Each structure stands twice: as C-alpha cells, then as structure tokens.
Design a protein around this ligand. Structure first.
Ligand SMILES: *[C@@H]1O[C@H](CO)[C@@H](O[C@@H]2O[C@H](CO)[C@@H](O)[C@H](O)[C@H]2NC(C)=O)[C@H](O)[C@H]1NC(C)=O
Ligand code: ALF
Ligand code: MG
Length: 1055
C-alpha cells in the first residue's frame, strides 16, 4: 500500500525554491505554515521512479486512511554495473533496474529449506562475499550522530522561538532593552542545553550499541582465526568459540551442542541448551523454529564439538535485520508524546492570538482617531500582540519541572527531559518487568527434602541448620567451585548452596578441602576424592568425597530429579516423587536432586578414584532434593497494594514461563486471593482450520486474564476485534519477545491508557522509551534509553515519580493560569490607557514583566507534593469549563476594579485631564496612568496567590513561607509607593495624590478585589463539580479503556 514516487527538475528551478525557503532557512516558512503536508507534496520536482535523488514514500493504513509522509535518499554503488539501494525507515529496500522492482532486504527468505542452509555449510568465494557485502551492507547497526546546525534546525523550527524572535526584534525597536535581553538569554541557554543533551544521548546510544569482536569465517581457503569483525555475511559460515563468546550475527548451529545466556533476548540469566540443526528436506525456514539458532547479543557460555573437529554455524540475519537491530530500530524513529494538556495549552495560546488580532484593529482605529504618527501605530499595534500572547510562558512552565527534578535528584531518581515529570500525574497503568525489578535477581535455595524412608519427607527451612551427618557433608562438598583469592569463583547457585550451609572451603590427591562455620553446638573437615562435570546431555555432576574417619568414601551425584530418579534404585525412588516434583515446579521452586552411592574404594589412590562416568553414576540412593526460587523483594508487596488502593492498574510483562508469572503475581498482590485469574491460549491455524481462542481458569483457595507471547501474536493478527477486550482485562503477559513488550505498550496507549514502564532493561529498553514515563532500575543499557533512572533498585521509585508528577501537573495548571491572567490584566491596562492616548510608562512595564512576574512564578512553583497518594487524579484538560470559567469570572472582577477606579479618579474634583496632544511616552507623569498602574500592580500579586490550589496534590500554601514573604515584601513596596510621596515616583513616572481619603478608597478597591478573587475562585472550586452532575447526570467518558470496561461490565468476554 506504500506510495513511492520519482523526482527531478531544472537546477535553476531548485535554486529558485532555495532562494524562496533555503535563504529564509525555513523559519518564515513555518511562520506561514500551519502544517507542511501541502508544501511537502510538490515542493520537490517530480520524475520517473526509474531514476531518483530522494523518494516520497507515503505509507497508507487503508482502514483509517493513515497517509504518513516520508522522503528517502537513493544510494548508488558499483558491485563491479551500478545497483540502486533505498534505506527506507532504517531497513534496505533494494531496487533491481532490469525488472523495475523494489525488493526489501530479508526477501531472500522464501522458507529456504533446513537442507538449503545445510547445502550452504561452507562460505562461497570472495566474488560471492563481494556481491553479498554490497547487497546487505556491513554487519553493524549505524546510529546517525547529527550536526549542531541540523539539531538547531529541528529545535529552532518550534514556532514559540519564532514568536520570541519577533518579540525580541520589536522590543529592541521600541527601546524595551532590559527585558528583551532577559528573554533572549533565557532562550539561548534553553536551546543550547537541548542541543547539548540531544547530541550526548545519540553519542552514548551509538557507543553502547556498537560491538567489536573479531570472528573466524569458516571457508576451505578462508577458515582462519579472527579473519574479520564487521565483514560477516548473511550466507557465511563461522566457527563458534570453544569458551565464552558474544554472538555478532543471528545464526543456526550446523555441528555440535552449546549452552547460551539469553539475558539480552528474554531477561532470564539461566543457561539454555542449543543443539545442531537436524538436516530437513522439508521447505522450512528456522524463523518459526527459533530453537537451534543463536541470536546477536546472546553469550555462548559453553560450545562442545563431538560429531566434528569444531562447533560450526551458518549465519541467518546480519546488521539491522537481527532482533537486537529490530530493538535499535524500535529505540530510534520515535512517535511524539500525546499529552492533552500540552496540545490544549497550544489551542488556548492560539485563541489569545485571535483576541490580539481583534485588539490590533481597536488600537489602530482609536490611535488613528487620536491622530498619532503612522510609525508609532505599527510598533504599538504589534506591541499589544506580544502583551496578549506571553513570550515567557514556556520558560515559566519549565520552572515547575526544574524544582521537581531537584527533589527527585535528592530522592536518588536521576531524570533527564524534566517535562516528562508532568506525564507522571496522568499515569493510569504501570507495567512491570519481573526479574531484578519486582523479584530478587538471583534464585535463592528455600529448602531441602530428606527422603529418609521409601516415601518423600518434609522440607527443612534453614540450610545453616544442616542435619549433622551425610546431608551436612553432601551439601558442603557438592561444589563445582574453583578456589580464588579470599573468594569462591563459580556458578551463583553453587556458591548459594555453599554459603547457605555456612561451611568454608580451604593429602596426595586431596582437592578443595571443606571445613565448618567455626561454631560447634560436627566439624568433620572432609576431602573431595573425585569430581565429574554437569554435561548438558547427561544432566548430572558427580563428586566422590571421603571424611577423615578411615572410612569407605561416598559418591554424591547432583542432577535433574527425573534423571537422578532414573539412575536411582526403584526401592529408593518414591511413587509420590512425580507429584512432589510437579508441585515444586508449579510453585516455581527449582528442583535439583542429589543422590549418594557408598563406594568400597581405598582413599587417596587415583586408580581407586578413576572409573567410567556412566558406571560411577549408574545406580545410587536419592540423598535429597534442593529447592530454589526468587524471594519477590522486601518493599514489592507494599508498593503494589498502594497502586491498587489508588486504582492505578499493574500489568506484569515478563520474558519468563507463565507458571512462574502466575505465582509471583499472586504473591505480588496484582491478583488478590479473592480475585479470579483466567489463562488465555490461542492455537495458530497450521492445519488450515482457522485459529481457536481457548480460555482455561486457575483455582486458588475484578476478573482478569493471563497470556503468553505466542497467544498475544495470534490475538494481535487473528483476533483484532478481541485484542481491546484482552488489553483492558489482561494483568500478566509472559514469554513476551522484546519487540512484543514495546507492542503491548503501543496497543495499551492507543486505548488512551497513559502508561509507565519500570524495568532493569536490555530486554524492556524498547518499552522504557515507548512508555510515557520510563523508569530504569539498572545504570547499564536501561539507564541510557530511560527518561527516569533510579539508583534505589526497587519498585518504591514508582510512587515517588507519580507524587512528584501530580504536584508538577497541578503547579503547571496554576502557573499557566497566572501567566494567562497576567497577560490579559496587562492587555486590559494597555487598552484602557490607549483609549485616552496614554500608555504604561517604560520602567512601569519592567516592574510588572521583570520583577513581579519572575518573583511570583519562581516562588509559587517551590511547593513539594502531598504526603500520601489519593484516589482523585489531577485534571489533564487546560481547555475546559472549570479553568475557562475561573479565568473569565476573575477577569470580569479585574476589569471591574480598573474601570471603577479610573471613573472614580475622573469623578473627584482635584482631577485634571491629560494633554492628549503630545504622545503616550511624552506625557510621563499623569493621574490616569498613576491610578491604573497603582490598582493594576496589586492585581498581579492578588491573582498569583488566588490561583495556587495547594491541598489535594501539593503541601498547603501557608507551608510555602518564601512565597508569602515575597508577596508581603512586594505588597509593602506597592503600598508605600501609593501611601507616601517617594523618590521612586520619579523613576516609575507616578504623580502623588493630595487626598489621603481617595488613596485609602483606591486601597479599598484593592482589598475588595483581594477578598473578591479568593472568594470567586473558592466558590467556583467548591460548586462547579456538583453543578456539572446537575447539568449532565448521564455524561460518559470518551477514553476508549473506560468504554471497553463498561461493555465488559454489561457482558464479560471469556466468562
Ligand atoms: C500638553 O502638551 C504639552 C506638554 O509639554 C504642552 O503643549 C505645548 O505647549 C507649548 C506652550 O507651552 C506650545 O507652544 C506647543 O505648541 C505645545 N505642543 C503640543 C504638541 O502640545 C501643553 O502643556 C499641553 N498642550 C496644549 C496645547 O495645551
Ligand atoms: F526480567 Al524480565 F521480562 F522478567 F526482562
Ligand atoms: Mg529483568
């Protein structure tokens, strides 16, 4: 469905439109452009799609008519005859000139037979390498680092900077030099900080994503060590390293068997067995199988060659095509954040521009009636537009976030992009990674089962209180651990077993001698006679150990419990073992069984110790099983209760097994004991019969759903109508691919849920960016991508960022209301004086614009958040009846006092009219200016105090002593300026009033509007919500999640 079009034109015609916009640099274009689509369409000069410079790709969603616009450069490279390559949206769409046909990179895949990949077991000649290198590019994910001019274009395209630039120009023209400098300097640091930050993030991301490991391509002429790094081709063959190696390319292992860590892909640190691909005549690609294939970013722990000279693999995917590359494409190319407040603010700012256009005509006509010079009128008309639309408004709103960032830094939460703190306020759903976020990172031995008799025996709580004798020996001496300088080096689970007992590891053939904790309530310090490894096929490791009693040694074999049972004698094995194993597996307790064979072998003789691995392990008595699980965390259960009490929903997104997710979620309190959990499985249509949705309930002593990634895939394609019904009711998503984690967050946010991701990353990094609020719980990988990074290493960060957001959004509402009211009250004062051929004097404007607004705006935004989270949520809508009503009614009172005062001043007999001949600047001292300015000054202080709500989301206003002091000291200066004739009257161009009575009445008008404003705001705040229900009782929410929850209330999908 993509709309791809070719382009060419006359060089003079291209230079012509470069004279129109490129000389202008675009900043006028956007000043005359609502949106660029109309311009974009035919700005570029069209041609045959055969030959092009850039390509207009317009991608349409047919269903929603989603005609998204893109323009993409044409790559021309010579293999030996030039081939056309197009780098669309990251990925390579390759154009064959001969067939006039676009073909995307990875269209090679035709379901290439398992046998086809086997046929290409060895990489072809330098001619094949040469062309493949041209077809697929280098084996790298190329993150572009853009230039300061290119970054400056995108930042400075923002229309407000255009308006600020226009404003600063007019201010330098009208001689308002002091404030002009302040707005320019504030802008300069803001743009610079944005540019510096933008470059740094790309630089760090480019550094992090780049992998530089030298590899050995396998070719009969070409199979040599470290022959290349970035040259490895999608068809090429490679030798897997015999030890630890980080895989550069997604590949399939032709020969041998390997153990890999998939922590990048899944987030589970436990090693996974990969075996040599069976040669398959059937035309099947490995994509579906996903089983015998090692992915880019995975670590090969162990690589074992048995059938061949070395472990041998064939590449499948390279560069941007690999899954890692898919995630890099996911973290690049980001959709903008949809926030009702920010768009509604721009609509309100636009509405003020319509009032400015009206104001300009009133200014023009009345000044023309005043018969002022034409020159004056054009500067003054424009000046009013800058009075109406406040040029500092963005800078003011940032001050709220800047404070909240500082509080968060003290709490240990390091937040880049502080405007994202506001999004914290609106969060309705927090999505959680399981491993190293909600649960503890390493599996911990919970207990051991004795098997004393024929049947199994009860689990022992404390390994430190080891039962003294053979179990105590077995647990202490069951080590694969290598001795290190004041440390045991080895596998964490093996370390945990040794640690949990409390025994410490320090003859001719005596190896790694085992000793006690050095408290006696048996010390019996013991030597390991023989040691046999945990081969992945075998699933068993055997340690022969002899205690210092001149006794027969015992051989302890630790293995997978079924294999241990198979090896173990049937009299030793219990019938209940299967049920016990099943129960512990279902509980999420890792079951690893240790068996004992009494051995009639002379100790300290290598001949006696030496036997066949299978013969030693062949028949034994099961000594016990070992049970290990994640312990949730200390603070995990509390945080989830608070979120659930607040009515914020919690969705467990894990890359782990669904059975584990079910038990941890129940423990977490995501699913409470009363709450009923349904398991949803979708069977794919492999037989051609269409896909079947199956719903199975879970029994335990707000109905919600548990899903797997495969199921999610089948629902996202084969049940599109039902996906919404899943998403609004699904609380556990398990075995989810790192792409699927992003996709969950994408489909949640299209349902109008404001969504927050908390995770330790490398798998959820995509979700961390995608989510409106992204919290990293690790300083590596996650930290770089996440807007918010904790160092606390708990879920307890999530409530703090909600609280800080709720304060920040409520403060941001008040600061916008203040900045709106200040611009309008100045707009009234300027127009009121303009009617009489007068203006607010220079240095009077400076008093209001510089000293008053800055002081109240900086000091009103200090208020920290409310102590405890409440069910009520801060409003998201700035363009709404409650806020607009407050502004309209406040302005009526404000206009009232000013007009009343002016006419009262006219009414008094001492009053003398102004010159009206000489101009607004020329008539420096005048009663009308003095009374308007004197009344107006107090209103800016009054409005600031009135708009600060405080109590529900922030600490009480009285707690903000600095703000009250600031208002008190500023109020004193103003009250002094009216009451006493002062030197300052000369600089501020104010005429003293003889009648103290009139001045006391003028203060009277101030105290009327003070009491009035506070009462007017309070009464509206109290009654308007009640009035809303009276006016519209049946009023229903527009948010899609709210509607779907209602539908579900009427009739339940999977009942
Ligand atoms: C108001 O405007 C000015 C204030 O300085 C004064 O007007 C000037 O007065 C002188 C005589 O003192 C005349 O020669 C000028 O023609 C006046 N010019 C203008 C432009 O007004 C005076 O105080 C007031 N003007 C009038 C006309 O009374
Ligand atoms: F640690 Al996870 F999905 F549970 F990355
Ligand atoms: Mg994790």
């Amino acid at each position: 469905s993509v709309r791809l079009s070719g382009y060419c034109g006359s060089p003079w015609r291209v230079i012509g439109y470069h004279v129109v916009v490129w000389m202008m640099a675009g900043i006028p274009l956007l000043l005359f452009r609502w949106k660029p689509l109309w311009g974009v369409r035919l700005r570029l000069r069209p041609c045959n799609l055969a030959h092009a410079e850039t390509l207009v790709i317009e991608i349409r969603d047919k269903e929603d008519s989603s005609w998204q616009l893109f323009t993409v450069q044409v790559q021309t490279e010579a293999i030996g005859r030039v081939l056309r390559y197009y780098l669309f949206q990251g990925q390579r769409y390759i154009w064959i000139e001969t067939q006039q046909a676009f073909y995307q990179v990875s269209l090679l895949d035709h379901g290439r037979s398992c046998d086809d990949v086997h046929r290409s077991r060895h990489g072809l000649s330098l001619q094949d390498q040469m062309v493949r290198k041209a077809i697929y590019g280098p084996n790298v994910i190329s993150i572009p680092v853009k230039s300061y001019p290119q970054l400056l274009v995108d930042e400075a395209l923002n229309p407000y900077y255009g308006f600020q630039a226009f404003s600063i120009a007019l201010w330098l023209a009208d001689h308002y030099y002091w404030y002009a400098l302040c707005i320019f300097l504030i802008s300069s640091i803001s743009i610079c900080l944005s540019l510096y930050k933008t470059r740094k993030q790309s630089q760090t991301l480019r550094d992090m994503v780049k992998l530089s490991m030298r590899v050995c391509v396998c070719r009969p002429g070409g199979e040599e060590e470290w022959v290349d790094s970035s040259e490895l081709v999608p068809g090429d063959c490679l030798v897997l390293p015999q030890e630890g190696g980080l895989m550069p390319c997604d590949a399939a292992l032709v020969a041998g068997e390997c153990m890999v860590n998939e922590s990048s892909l899944t987030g589970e640190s436990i090693p996974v067995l990969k075996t040599a691909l069976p040669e398959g005549l059937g035309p099947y690609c490995a994509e579906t199988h996903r089983r015998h294939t090692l992915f880019c970013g995975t670590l090969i722990l162990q690589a074992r060659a048995y059938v061949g000279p070395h472990v041998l693999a064939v590449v499948t995917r390279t560069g941007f095509c690999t899954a890692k590359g898919g995630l890099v494409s996911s973290i690049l190319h980001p959709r903008p954040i949809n926030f009702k407040f920010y768009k509604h603010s721009m609509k309100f700012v636009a509405a003020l521009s319509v009032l400015a256009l009206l104001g300009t005509i009133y200014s023009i006509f009345i000044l023309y009636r005043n018969r002022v010079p034409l020159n004056e009128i054009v500067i003054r008309a424009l000046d009013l537009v800058t009075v109406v639309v406040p040029p500092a408004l963005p800078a003011a709103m940032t001050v709220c976030t800047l404070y909240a960032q500082s509080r968060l830094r003290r709490q240990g939460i390091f937040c880049i992009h502080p405007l994202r703190i506001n999004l914290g306020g609106k969060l309705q759903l927090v999505c959680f990674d399981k491993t190293g976020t909600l649960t503890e990172d390493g599996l911990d031995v919970m207990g051991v089962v004795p098997l004393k008799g024929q049947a199994f025996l009860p689990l022992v709580p404390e390994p430190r209180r080891l039962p003294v004798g053979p179990l105590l020996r077995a647990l202490a001496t069951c080590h694969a651990l290598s001795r290190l300088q004041d440390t045991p080096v080895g596998d964490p689970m093996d370390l945990k077993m040794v640690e949990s007992t409390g025994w410490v590891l320090e003859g001719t053939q005596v190896l790694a001698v085992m000793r006690p904790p050095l408290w006696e309530p048996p010390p019996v310090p013991v030597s390991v006679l023989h040691r046999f490894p945990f081969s992945s096929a075998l699933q068993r490791m055997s340690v022969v150990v002899a205690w210092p009693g001149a006794t027969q040694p015992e051989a302890y074999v630790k293995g997978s419990p079924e294999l241990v049972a198979g090896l173990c004698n049937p009299e030793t094995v219990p019938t209940d073992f299967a049920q016990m194993l099943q129960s512990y597996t279902a509980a999420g307790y890792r079951v690893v069984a240790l068996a004992s064979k009494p051995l009639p072998t002379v100790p300290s003789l290598e001949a006696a110790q030496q036997l066949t691995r299978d013969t030693v392990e062949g028949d034994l008595s099961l000594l016990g099983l070992l049970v290990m699980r994640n312990l949730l965390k200390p603070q995990t259960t509390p945080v989830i209760q608070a979120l659930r009490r607040t009515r914020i929903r919690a969705v467990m997104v894990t890359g782990d097994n669904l059975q584990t997710a079910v038990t941890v979620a129940r423990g977490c309190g995501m699913v409470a004991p009363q709450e009923h959990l349904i398991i949803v499985h979708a069977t794919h249509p492999e037989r051609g019969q269409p896909a079947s949705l199956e719903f199975l309930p879970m029994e335990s002593p707000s109905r919600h759903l548990a899903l797997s990634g495969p199921t999610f895939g089948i629902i996202v394609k084969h049940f599109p109508k039902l996906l919404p019904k899943v998403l609004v009711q699904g609380t556990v998503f398990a075995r989810m691919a790192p792409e699927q984690k992003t996709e969950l967050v994408c489909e949640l946010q299209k349902l109008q849920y404001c969504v927050g991701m908390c995770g330790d990353g490398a798998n959820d990094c995509g979700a961390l960016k995608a989510a409106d609020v992204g919290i990293s719980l690790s300083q590596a990988e996650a930290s770089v991508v996440s807007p918010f990074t904790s160092s606390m290493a708990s879920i307890e960060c999530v409530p703090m960022v909600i609280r800080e957001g709720r304060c920040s959004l409520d403060t941001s509402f008040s600061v916008f209301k203040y900045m709106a009211l200040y611009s309008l009250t100045q707009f009234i004062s300027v127009l009121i004086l303009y009617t009489i051929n007068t203006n607010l004097g220079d240095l009077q404007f400076l008093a209001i614009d510089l000293v008053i607004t800055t002081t109240v705006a900086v000091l009103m935004s200090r208020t920290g958040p409310a102590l405890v989270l409440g069910r009520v949520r801060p409003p998201g809508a700035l363009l709404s009846v409650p806020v607009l009503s407050s502004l309209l009614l406040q302005m009526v009172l404000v206009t009232g006092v000013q007009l009343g005062g002016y006419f009262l001043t006219l009414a008094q007999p001492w009053f003398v009219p102004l010159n009206r001949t000489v101009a607004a600047p020329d008539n420096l001292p005048n009663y009308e200016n003095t009374v308007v300015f004197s009344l107006s000054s107090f209103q800016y202080l009054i409005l600031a105090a009135a708009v600060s709500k405080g109590a529900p989301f922030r600490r009480p206003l009285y707690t903000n002593v600095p703000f009250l002091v600031a208002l008190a000291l500023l109020s004193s200066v103003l009250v002094g300026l009216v009451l006493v004739p002062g030197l300052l009257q000369g600089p501020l161009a104010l005429r003293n009033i003889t009648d103290t009575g009139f001045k006391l009445l003028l203060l009277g008008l101030v105290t009327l509007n003070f009491v009035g404003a506070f009462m007017l705001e309070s009464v509206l705040d109290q009654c308007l919500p009640a009035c809303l229900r009276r006016l519209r009782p049946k009023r229903a929410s527009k948010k899609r999640f709210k509607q779907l929850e209602r539908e579900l209330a009427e009739q339940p999908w999977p009942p």
